[PDB]
A paper describes a structure:
Upon illumination, the excitation energy is sequentially transferred from the chlorosome BChls through a monolayered baseplate, Fenna-Matthews-Olson (FMO) complexes, and ultimately to a membrane-embedded RC, where charge separation occurs. Because only one gene encodes two copies of the GsbRC core proteins (PscA subunit), the GsbRC has a homodimeric architecture with a symmetric distribution of pigments, suggesting two identical branches of electron transport chains (ETC) that could be equally utilized. Two membrane-associated PscC subunits (cytochrome cz or cyt c551) contain the cytochrome c domain, which mediates electron transfer from the menaquinol/cytochrome c oxidoreductase to the P84026–29. On the cytoplasmic surface, PscB binds two FeS clusters (FA and FB), serving as terminal electron acceptors.
However, our RC-FMO2 structure reveals the association of two FMO trimers, two PscC subunits, two accessory membrane subunits, and additional pigment molecules. In the RC-FMO2 supercomplex, the orientation of the two FMO trimers does not follow the symmetry of the PscA dimer, and each associate with the RC through a unique binding interface. The residues that contact FMO2 are more distant than those contacting FMO1, and the effective areas that contact FMO2 are much smaller than those for FMO1, resulting in a larger solvent-excluded surface for FMO1 with the membrane RC (624.0 Å2) than that for FMO2 (247.1 Å2). A BChl pigment (BChl-A816) and a monogalactosyl diglyceride (MGDG) lipid are located between PscF and PscA1. Therefore, this identified BChl is very likely to serve as a linker bacteriochlorophyll to mediate exciton transfer from FMO1 to the RC. This linker BChl is not found at the FMO2 and PscA2 interface, and the spaces between PscA2, PscC, PscE, and FMO2 are filled with lipid molecules, leaving no space for additional BChls. The linker pigment was identified along the FMO1-PscA1 axis, but not the FMO2-PscA2 axis, and this could result in a higher energy transfer efficiency in the FMO1-PscA1 pathway than the FMO2-PscA2. Also, when the RC-FMO2 structure is compared to the RC-FMO1 or the previous cryo-EM structure, a loop of PscD (Q83-P108) exhibits a slight conformational change in the presence of the second FMO trimer. Compared to the RC-FMO1 structure presented here or the previous cryo-EM structure, the RC-FMO2 structure has revealed additional pigments: one BChl a (located at the interface between FMO1 and PscA1), one F39 (located near the PscA dimer interface), and one F26 (located in the PscA2). In the RC-FMO2 supercomplex, the binding of PscB and PscD with the two FMO trimers leaves one side in the cytoplasmic space available for ferredoxin docking, and the size of this open space is sufficient for the entry of one ferredoxin molecule.
Author numbering:
A (entry chain V): 7 to 366
B (entry chain A): 62 to 708
C (entry chain F): 3 to 52
D (entry chain D): 20 to 120
E (entry chain B): 3 to 16, 130 to 229
Write the structure that this text describes.
């Protein structure tokens, strides 16, 4: 009875032609205990994208994370207006709210993110068809306004302004505060390092309700290539490929008994052009793998995995490493064997390739 | 012919298909059991003897389900026993087909509770899986090997219980009775239990399989089971001829077998089937009702060795075909992984060690050189023995290889060691080498051959009949074509097997011929057993009795028709047939329109070269071995009285 | 001394050092002309290594 | 082990000269692409070393936007046999689709 | 602790412009059969002495409809059947196997010595 097994069922239903729109249906469970020092940890995530204006590239993305962890009904909602300006700059108007137990507070931000690669050499991109590791830096300039409606909000504002005006290492220890718990151990495990922030301003002004605290700060996410927020900067924002609303409804309930994960999404960018007429199920982001490896190495598990890639009619998978167990004339199925070994590889922190090159 | 491909089916579908086929096979077994009922339980006369039941009557009487006793009494009891066991097989096969339908449709919902079990996760039989497996094979065939070993251990145990109680054969160590088969049934339980546990706790690894390998694992296990069949055929031949099996196989000769199609009591033309029917005409042999199938003694027919030969050759033909099919399906998998590029990514000796084309060429060259050497040696020996016995070029039998017995260290394998056994062994090695040329070509030269990598060509479609007349001709170069050539080459080793087991003198083509010294082999070689006539005269001697049977004659004609029909598709005629079929279509069109106003709009179909080769090899094998069945079903006809010198 | 005796019982085990083709040939030689022919094979190859 | 890496019909990996443009006037616009079709490379000196060593096999199609005839070094004493340099040799694949029905 | 959300995961169980290189075609015709019957862009051109390889394959680009049946079939044995992508790159196959640096792994003591 004391057997640790990781059951799973992934499904990728693609759309034909240039459309990269894919439907991801992932069920999973494992009787291994979670790594949360507070249990049980249950969470739901709703991530809905609507193209607000195709001409200006503005896409309204709404993210609602609800969670209960040791009986704490946390809930973070955020609605942003992400929009490219250049190939290396994005703007994001947005609003949002965060509620923990009884406490709650809103925010409204006007952020701007500039992702600059450390090199744009033509040799690398003309020699490597699949450039995974692209070192770079990502400068975030965030202007966030919070209405100070609660006693705790004003107390925190006072404490933070006192710390900035009195402590000379706030810009450096803010990372220690901010990457709570193992997060600081994660940025070092993914090749990331966050530079000292540049708090350009802390002010408070009258607003529609009362005193609103405005913070203008800057930081820089530094990726060594393994970071998907840098190497895949254009790949992770397919607004150009976004024609209809996209959805991602996920959730995980993780008690001492085990973890159960359910995900249902439909969104673009699942299939990217690999050249030679071969579309490819996109390169797997490496940050999820190397970050989940900080928890997946804690118990030996028997993998029971099944990946069902439902190709559009007419398309065939020419390469599959590991190879597809079965095929219902469009529904290629990976189950057991080298696929199970790869599922163990990536469930424990591996970043190995799983090539799926399909073409018509 | 590809509808049930491995890729098209998943593991549960295969489980269900095998289960439903086991049920169908149990129905077939019940049919054979009922066919074996010589006297019905109600008293009336029963079915005649069929080869389908004369093949299993030895085993059935071994288990006491059948009886060699000849009185109507206790033969009625044997018939009732056979009916009961056939009904058991029928019902269990119904249940097996139900399970097979459920697995094929994946509707594994209990009809009582409705709980839908999971093929991926399922406790076996309830608590036993918890005690032993602790949870199923989450995935993987490697984790399934141990569970299957435990299942086979339970099968062995169940057979032990059944024979101990139901069939009344207690477990006794002595290996001269069926009792040991009970004893060992328990032994092989523990073994196949313990090993299973081991393979459950310590799984084995051959990473080529386990991944996308229903075809790959199927190929390996089909080759393995083909060698299992060959070993079973050899074991059956040896054991069924041993004294311990004589009560069940040698006592066939004491019985008289009324077989369907055998000579029937003939009647004059002026015959009327009324009452006694004597006044109108005269039946051939009196005391038997007109048109009745006349008795045939097993002593003359040699039914002991006939049934032994039928079983042995069944297993040998099935095993050789399974080896060839396993190599072919493994070649299909090899070609698939070569096309998709996994070939170089396999990290196992079964693929890596032959990755180099140099080693493949050296392997096939060694096989070809050994085949040339052995074939040349055996054929020179045989043709020289024929030159001597026929006294051609002034020769005489004294110059033949009568001295070339198997060495004293190898005469244990052979009852009467002579040049016949030497030629048998070396012909078997040579035929194995010949078929291995094609099997190795499938194994290695599946996607590219050294000629083709030099010629700048690659084998992609695994069934393409050719690439055209380029380079003088590219006929029959797919792995499917090599499989067909392997089958047509193993035809000869399989023949040698048939002719050896049916008593032929394969060391010379003309043994027993009434010419020169052909009948002197028994004196010069000092043979004890009088071997059936030689390779060319064996046809004649066996057809003395094939021709005496209407049924065997019908088989002869039909198999010969089937065989020669194969050339219409195997010969380089496909284009001629296509042109002629266009002419046929036009002829039908205009002839019909003139003769009948209705238009045709139909074309005569012509097989593609791939389908042509498929059907041609099927017909070639079918005719050849439907006739080998006549060779093995005429009778052994090898007596233990050597023929004196011709002079 | 272990290699040669293992060879006289298991010649292909002795030629295991040699290429897979040689190992297969020695196995076939065990199958046909067991010991004398295959013992000849192993002694030839091992003495050649010397 | 060499026949099973890449296409089995090309012992030396083949590189078609797909695109070349006279506008840049340097002929660096020559853009070699392997038969696999995933690397739009350029005729660098390392590619020259590979070509002379025989590891690769540069080829030219006839049906295309003309690469460079007499503008990329050409030998016309016989039928044209284009060369990146006299020691190099770009064997032109011939493609007769227009001349024949 | 006990307060939770709820969820159920039933996992446990409990443009193209295809061409033919006349230099390399062997005239097998495995691509002709794939061409749609009415299109029939692919045709046979004969020089002489069929056994000497005179017969060859040609795609009439006017007749071709970029249906990809000829090339996607993976039927060309010689690699003559090529696809020129809209930007331009010659594809001799739907997917060529990756290039590898190979060596025979012979172990030291146990399995394949030397
Ligand atoms: C996570 C790794 C990086 C990071 C990388 C990025 C990337 C990449 C982007 C931003 C962008 C933004 N960043 Mg940031 N950023 C990080 C840390 C921060 C922190 C912080 C306190 O930690 C803050 C305040 C911000 C601030 C902001 C905003 C100003 C801005 C818009 C966010 C928005 O869309 O949110 C709404 C909230 C969500 C979308 C919630 C879910 C977030 C996850 C990561 C998205 C997963 C997508 C999923 C795999 C695919 C689902 C398909 C769905 C249909 C969408 N960043 C760290 C250091 N940041 C964006 C931009 O350029 O702004 C101009 C942008 O594209
Ligand atoms: C020396 C090793 C690296 C490299 C190391 C860095 C580092 C480190 C940094 C830059 C920075 C920059 N480099 Mg650089 N850079 C490389 C090669 C290149 C190539 C190229 C032809 O591939 C390009 C286009 C650039 C261009 C640039 C800009 C993206 C940026 C300019 C900042 C500024 O204000 O001025 N570098 C080489 C290969 N470069 C800076 C930047 O803004 O980083 C985000 C920076 O700090
Ligand atoms: C503010 C954050 C950024 C951003 C950050 C990232 C990052 C970082 C990554 C992506 C990735 C992807 N994003 Mg994004 N993404 C943004 C906006 C979008 C929009 C859009 C037009 O609004 C779309 C359609 C997408 C779509 C996509 C896909 C192309 C791609 C995942 C492919 C895959 O198969 O997913 C399969 C998806 C699933 C398996 C389901 C995953 C479900 C969960 C709920 C989403 C991740 C949540 C994360 C673990 C927790 C976030 C907590 C934060 C602290 C708030 N993103 C915003 C602007 N996106 C990834 C990718 O593959 O890059 C190449 C990647 O690395
Ligand atoms: C003949 C020489 C070889 C052989 C050569 C081939 C070739 C060549 C091919 C296969 C193919 C297949 N073979 Mg095979 N294979 C052999 C032995 C076997 C054995 C075995 C007995 O152990 C098995 C299980 C298989 C299994 C299989 C499948 C993996 C696959 C698809 C079969 C199916 O769907 O066909 C559907 C048709 C069948 C069910 C078989 C035909 C029999 C009919 C349906 C039986 C009932 C009617 C009646 C009794 C007999 C027929 C004649 C009557 C006049 C109607 N082969 C024999 C010994 N095999 C094909 C495949 O796709 O490969 C990838 C393929 O091309
Ligand atoms: C004895 C152990 C043998 C073996 C004996 C057989 C035989 C015998 C047959 C199969 C059949 C099949 N085998 Mg098997 N099989 C073995 C091991 C395997 C393994 C594995 C190791 O995991 C795999 C993946 C397979 C794969 C498969 C499938 C291709 C197929 C079952 C699907 C099904 O029934 O379709 C659904 C199809 C139906 C139920 C229709 C069946 C129609 C008729 C009644 C049978 C058709 C084939 C032919 C007449 C049988 C000829 C036997 C000859 C007399 C020698 N075999 C070993 C090697 N297997 C069957 C198949 O379909 O063959 C083509 C089949 O007959
Ligand atoms: C002859 C009957 C057939 C068959 C017909 C059925 C039928 C009918 C049903 C299933 C159901 C199930 N089958 Mg089944 N199935 C067969 C063999 C298999 C094999 C195998 C060992 O290779 C596998 C992997 C499975 C898989 C499964 C499970 C997913 C599921 C049971 C869940 C579990 O917890 O049940 C615990 C027990 C099991 C794992 C069953 C194992 C198979 C046994 C041998 C069935 C015997 C049935 C027979 C009438 C009773 C005779 C018992 C005597 C002791 C011999 N079956 C046998 C050989 N299978 C059942 C279901 O859905 O359960 C909820 C169900 O009702
Ligand atoms: C020995 C036990 C099994 C066996 C188990 C396996 C396994 C396991 C695999 C194969 C695989 C294959 N088998 Mg097999 N196979 C056997 C019998 C055969 C016979 C035959 C007529 O005897 C043939 C021709 C084949 C043919 C083939 C090919 C279709 C394929 C390998 C292709 C390749 O590249 O090989 C490259 C060439 C070689 C590796 C040559 C060297 C041989 C290896 C090292 C082992 C045997 C030699 C041994 C050391 C000899 C000396 C001692 C003696 C044992 C006394 N098998 C028997 C029945 N076979 C593979 C495949 O892909 O299946 C679909 C696979 O996974
Ligand atoms: C019984 C054996 C044979 C036939 C029966 C026959 C019949 C036949 N053949 Mg054949 N054939 C060989 C055997 C037989 N070929 C051999 C061993 C070779 C090796 C060289 C060979 C070779 C070629 C080439 C190269 C070409 C052809 C053709 C061509 C036909 C198309 C029209 C025609 O000829 O009608 C004239 C022929 C007849 C109509 C024959 C009359 C029927 C009969 C009395 C009884 C049929 C019995 C039956 C076959 C048994 C089972 C049936 C049922 C119970 C399941 C056509 C009907 C070609 C054409 O299409 O052009 C004309 C062509 O080009 N062949
Ligand atoms: C290893 C060496 C290979 C040679 C194999 C020995 C053959 C001699 C033999 O029959 O054994 C000799 C033994 C007994 O040899 C004696 O022979 C006598 C005939 O003179 C009678 O048969 C006696 O009963 C028997 O004792 O015979 C058998 O075991 C016959 C069973 C079938 C054996 C052949 C199966 C081989 C299958 C390969 C088919 C190739 C297809 C391609
Ligand atoms: C086991 C194998 C399973 C099945 C394969 C077995 C199989 O396919 O057979 C093999 C072969 C059929 O191959 P073909 O592709 O050439 O068949 C074309 C047919 O339409 C005959 O032209 O048969 C023969 O040619 C001999 C028997 C034909 C005899 C039939 C006569 C047809 C008469 C047609 C009308 C003639 C009149 C002329 C009018 C002008
Ligand atoms: S004779 Fe027939 S099989 Fe041979 S190459 Fe020509 S078309 Fe192909
Ligand atoms: Ca006989």
């Amino acid at each position: 009875n004391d057997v640790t097994t990781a059951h799973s069922d992934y499904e990728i239903v693609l759309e034909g032609g240039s459309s990269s729109w894919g439907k991801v249906k992932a069920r999973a469970k494992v009787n291994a205990p979670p790594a949360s020092p507070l249990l049980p940890a249950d969470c739901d995530v709703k991530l809905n994208v609507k193209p607000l204006d195709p001409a200006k590239g503005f896409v309204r993305i709404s993210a609602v994370f609800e969670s209960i962890v040791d009986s704490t009904k946390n809930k973070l909602t955020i609605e942003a207006d992400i929009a490219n300006e250049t190939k290396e700059r994005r703007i994001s108007v947005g609003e949002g709210m965060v509620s923990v137990g009884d406490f709650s507070h809103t925010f409204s931000f006007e952020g701007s993110v500039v992702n600059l690669f450390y090199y744009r050499s033509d040799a690398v991109r003309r020699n490597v068809p699949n450039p995974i590791y692209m070192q770079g830096r990502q400068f975030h300039d965030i202007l966030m306004k919070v209405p100070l409606d609660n006693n705790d909000l004003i107390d925190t504002w006072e404490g933070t302004v006192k710390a900035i005006g009195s402590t000379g290492a706030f810009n450096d220890w803010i990372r220690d505060f901010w990457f709570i718990g193992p997060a600081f151990t994660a940025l070092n495990e993914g090749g990331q390092r966050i530079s000292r922030i540049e708090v350009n301003g802390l002010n408070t002004e009258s607003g529609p309700k009362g005193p609103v605290g405005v913070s203008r700060w800057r930081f820089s996410h530094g990726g060594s290539g393994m970071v998907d927020s840098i190497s895949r900067w254009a790949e992770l924002f397919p607004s150009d490929k976004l024609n209809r609303p996209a959805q991602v409804e996920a959730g995980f309930r993780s008690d001492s008994q085990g973890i159960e994960v359910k995900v249902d999404g439909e969104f673009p960018g699942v299939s990217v052009d690999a050249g030679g007429g071969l579309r490819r199920i996109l390169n797997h982001p490496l940050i999820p793998l190397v970050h989940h490896g900080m928890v997946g190495k804690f118990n030996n598990f028997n993998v029971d995995a099944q990946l069902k890639v439902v190709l559009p009619k007419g398309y065939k998978i020419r390469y599959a490493a590991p190879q597809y167990r079965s095929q219902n004339l469009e529904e290629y199925r990976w189950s057991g064997g080298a696929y199970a070994r790869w599922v163990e590889h990536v469930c424990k922190g591996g970043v190995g390739q799983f090539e799926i090159l399909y073409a018509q | 012919y590809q509808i049930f491909d491995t890729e098209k089916l998943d593991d549960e579908q295969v489980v269900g298909g095998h289960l439903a086929l086991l049920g169908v096979l149990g129905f077939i077994m019940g049919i054979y059991y009922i066919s074996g009922i010589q006297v019905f339980p109600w008293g009336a006369p029963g079915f005649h003897d069929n080869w389908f039941y004369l093949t299993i009557k030895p085993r059935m009487v071994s288990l006491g389900i059948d009886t060699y006793s000849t009185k109507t009494a206790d033969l009625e009891a044997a018939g009732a026993r056979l009916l009961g066991w056939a009904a058991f097989h029928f019902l269990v096969g119904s249940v097996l087909i139900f399970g097979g339908w459920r697995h094929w449709t994946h509707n594994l919902t209990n009809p009582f509770t409705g709980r839908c079990g999971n093929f991926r996760d399922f406790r076996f039989l309830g608590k036993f899986g918890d005690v032993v497996f602790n949870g199923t094979s989450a995935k993987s065939y490697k984790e399934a090997l141990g569970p299957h070993a435990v299942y086979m251990s339970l099968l062995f145990l169940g057979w032990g219980i059944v024979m101990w109680a139901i069939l009344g054969f207690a477990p006794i160590p002595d290996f001269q009775t069926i009792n040991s088969e009970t004893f060992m049934s328990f032994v092989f339980a523990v073994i196949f239990f313990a090993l299973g546990i081991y393979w459950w706790n310590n799984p084995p690894n051959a990473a080529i399989h386990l991944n996308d390998d229903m075809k790959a694992a199927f190929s390996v296990h089909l080759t393995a089971i083909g060698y299992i069949n060959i070993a079973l055929g050899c074991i059956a031949f040896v054991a069924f001829q041993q004294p311990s099996f004589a009560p069940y196989y040698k006592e066939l000769d004491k019985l008289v077998f009324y077989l369907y199609g055998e000579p029937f009591n003939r009647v004059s033309f002026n015959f009327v089937e009324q009452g006694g029917k004597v006044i109108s005409g005269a039946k051939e042999f009196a005391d038997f009702p007109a048109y009745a199938i006349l008795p045939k003694s097993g002593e003359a027919f040699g039914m002991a060795r006939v049934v032994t030969n039928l079983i042995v050759f069944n297993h040998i033909i099935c095993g050789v075909l399974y080896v060839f099919a396993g190599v072919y399906h493994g070649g299909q998998y090899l070609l698939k992984i070569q096309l998709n590029g996994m070939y170089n990514q396999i990290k196992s000796i079964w693929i890596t060690k032959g990755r180099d084309q140099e080693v493949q060429v050296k392997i096939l060259g060694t096989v070809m050189a050994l085949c040339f050497a052995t074939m040349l040696s055996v054929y020179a020996v045989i043709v020289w023995n024929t030159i001597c016995e026929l006294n051609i070029f002034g020769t005489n039998i004294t110059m033949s290889f009568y001295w070339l017995k198997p060495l004293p260290i190898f005469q244990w394998m052979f009852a009467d060691p002579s040049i016949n056994d030497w030629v048998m062994a070396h012909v078997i090695t040579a035929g194995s080498l010949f078929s291995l040329i094609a099997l190795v070509r499938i194994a290695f030269f599946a996607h590219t051959s050294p000629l083709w990598d030099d010629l700048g060509l690659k084998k992609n479609s695994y069934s393409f009949p050719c690439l055209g007349p380029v380079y003088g001709g590219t006929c029959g170069v797919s792995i499917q074509d090599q499989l067909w050539f392997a089958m047509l080459w193993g035809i000869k080793g399989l023949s040698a097997v048939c002719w050896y087991i049916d008593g032929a003198w394969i060391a010379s083509m003309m043994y027993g011929v009434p010419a020169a010294d052909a009948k002197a082999w028994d004196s010069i070689a000092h043979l004890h057993h009088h071997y059936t006539s030689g390779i060319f005269y064996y046809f004649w001697t066996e057809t003395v009795t094939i021709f005496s049977s209407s049924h065997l004659s019908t088989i002869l004609m039909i198999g010969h028709l089937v065989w020669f029909i194969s050339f219409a598709v195997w010969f380089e005629d496909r284009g001629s047939r296509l042109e002629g079929a266009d002419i046929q279509t036009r002829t039908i069109r205009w002839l019909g329109k003139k003769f009948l106003n209705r238009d045709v709009n139909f074309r005569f179909p012509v097989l593609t070269i791939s389908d042509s080769k498929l059907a041609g090899t099927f017909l070639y094998f079918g005719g050849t071995f439907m006739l080998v069945f006549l060779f093995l079903a005429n009778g052994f006809y090898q007596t233990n009285s050597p023929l004196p010198p011709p002079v | 001394i272990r290699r040669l005796i293992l060879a006289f019982i298991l010649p292909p085990a002795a030629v295991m050092n040699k290429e897979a083709g040689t190992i297969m040939l020695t196995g076939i030689l065990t199958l046909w002309g067991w010991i004398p022919g295959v013992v000849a094979a192993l002694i030839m190859i091992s003495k050649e290594q010397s | 082990s060499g026949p099973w890496s890449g296409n089995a019909v090309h012992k030396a990996e083949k590189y078609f000269i797909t695109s070349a443009k006279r506008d840049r006037d340097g002929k660096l616009q020559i853009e070699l692409v392997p038969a696999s079709g995933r690397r739009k490379l350029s005729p660098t000196p390392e590619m020259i070393r590979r070509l002379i060593d025989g590891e690769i096999e540069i080829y030219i199609l006839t049906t295309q936007p003309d690469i460079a005839i007499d503008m990329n070094k050409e030998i016309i004493d016989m039928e044209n046999r284009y060369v990146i340099d006299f020691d190099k040799r770009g064997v032109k694949w011939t493609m007769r689709e227009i001349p024949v029905f | 602790e006990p307060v939770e959300n709820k969820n159920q995961a039933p996992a446990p169980g409990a443009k193209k412009h295809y061409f033919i290189i006349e230099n390399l075609c062997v005239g097998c015709g495995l691509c002709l059969d794939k061409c749609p019957p009415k299109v029939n862009a692919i045709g046979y051109k004969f020089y002489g002495d069929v056994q000497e390889g005179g017969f060859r394959c040609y795609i009439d680009q006017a007749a071709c409809i970029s249906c990809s049946a000829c090339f996607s079939g993976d039927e060309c044995p010689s690699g003559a059947l090529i696809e020129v992508l809209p930007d331009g790159e010659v594809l001799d196959f739907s997917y060529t196997p990756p290039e590898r640096l190979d060596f025979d792994l012979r172990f030291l003591h146990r399995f394949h010595r030397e």
